[PDB]
């Protein structure tokens, strides 16, 4: 079994078609060497959002292994200079990083992300899933 | 104006074989804060490479980050090797184990000896990396 990272997302103006590039309900497989990146640029980031307020790279999720542990954990890092990244109650500035827990709420600009880590046996690769939310998350 | 440079003194008993031939010394190569510096035998995957069979595809990676309540860049290390361990000073990092590097520390993997030393700067958009060879062992 592979370690999945479920990412429920939300945005006020999502009806315009910001998450058209984003593929929902799909466990896309990533190796542990690779680093998942978010933003607007297509060549730099994997998951893109069509918006001017969003930076070229908003943030990055990188997998790792905690000490005395046999499962992948994820670390976040805000790459935006303008907008802050609210990892739960913690404000992450430019290039500030923090280890993500099993469940957390990410907020930037007017976006709302609800990350949720489901553990797995494999450490060589992980997976990522996306779910569109109708109501606001918080 | 100034840039945060990372002085990296290195050593290997069999460095005479020609392991650090791809590595250029006494030259501060520029890198942006988005980029991640990687180390290993693989040519394209890593920036700084080592011609050796015992070295993994990617041995380890250095990545810049800003600590909280700090105006200068700091570096985090992560061991990408499955087989061989990575010794940060006295701490042993296994597969995908990470740790925030201090100003001065001794990285050790296999028979390689790396002495890192961070010289701070003003800019947080980019960083530098210089390489120096040692005749004697570092430890």
Author numbering:
A (entry chain B): 12 to 149
B (entry chain A): 11 to 149
Task: Cite, word for word, the article reporting this structure.
TRAF-interacting protein with a forkhead-associated (FHA) domain (TIFA) was originally identified as an adaptor protein that interacts with TRAF2 and TRAF61–3. TIFA has an FHA domain, involved in its binding to phosphothreonine (pThr), and has a consensus TRAF6-binding motif [PXEXX(Ar/Ac); Ar, aromatic; Ac, acidic; X, any] at the C-terminus for interaction with the TRAF-C domain of TRAF6 (TRAF6-C). Furthermore, oligomeric forms of TIFA promote oligomerisation and polyubiquitination of TRAF6, leading to the activation of IκB kinase (IKK). TIFA exists as an intrinsic dimer, and phosphorylation of TIFA at Thr9 promotes its oligomerisation through the intermolecular interaction of pThr9 with the FHA domain between the dimers.
